[PDB]
Write a protein that binds this ligand. Structure first.
Ligand code: ZN
Ligand code: ZN
Lengths: 187, 13
């Protein structure tokens, strides 16, 4: 016996991965059989469950989330010049899936990102485009949406999203509101 | 592109 492979802690729900102790914890954070937590930003909701329980949870506990149908929308964040840590959240539905669109203002910079209510593998089929439009000015960010399984905190932390500041916001804002064009496509 | 517009109100943490 030269060494031992240990089963993923999520084997009980179907995971078949068995690995050395040194690369076990790494897998378990990434593992698809890990429970899903609440995709809403912040910690005021500590819910957890199955992927197909996520939308029901949002529909019961977070009824105030604005939702639009379509692959092309305008996400109009109102009151952008508010001081401090502020969030704007909405749902976009298209291609039979639901996407969470998030704009975060940190106490100052703005971070805008899109996440899929779905698995990491599902997220790979999609591209999103965020674009800010002004008079003969356009800033565009394009990327693969994150799965809510992974979340957006790490991405935001490494600026792996649309990142702009309050000065840039002024070039694109109208009446203290910023219209962000969001397009989702299958690639 | 046909774009519905959603007015989203801010949330403070
Ligand atoms: Zn696993
Ligand atoms: Zn929740």
């Amino acid at each position: 016996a030269n060494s031992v492979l240990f089963p993923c802690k999520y084997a009980s729900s179907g995971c078949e991965i068995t690995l050395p102790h040194t690369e076990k914890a790494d897998h378990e954070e990434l593992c698809e059989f890990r429970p899903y937590s609440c995709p809403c930003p912040g910690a005021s909701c500590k819910w957890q469950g199955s992927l197909d329980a996520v939308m029901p949870h949002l529909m019961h506990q977070h009824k105030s989330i604005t939702t639009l149908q379509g692959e092309d929308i305008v996400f109009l964040a109102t009151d952008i010049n508010l001081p401090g840590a502020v969030d704007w959240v909405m749902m976009q539905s298209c291609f039979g899936f639901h996407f969470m669109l998030v704009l975060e203002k940190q106490e100052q910079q703005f971070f805008a990102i899109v996440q899929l209510i779905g698995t990491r593998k599902q997220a790979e089929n999609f591209a999103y485009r965020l674009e800010l439009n002004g008079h003969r000015r356009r800033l565009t960010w394009e990327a693969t949406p994150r799965s809510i399984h992974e979340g957006i905190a790490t991405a935001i932390m490494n600026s792996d999203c649309l990142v702009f500041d309050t000065s840039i916001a002024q070039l694109f804002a109208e009446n203290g509101n910023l219209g962000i064009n969001v397009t989702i496509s299958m690639c | 592109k046909l774009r519905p517009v959603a007015m989203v109100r801010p949330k403070v943490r």
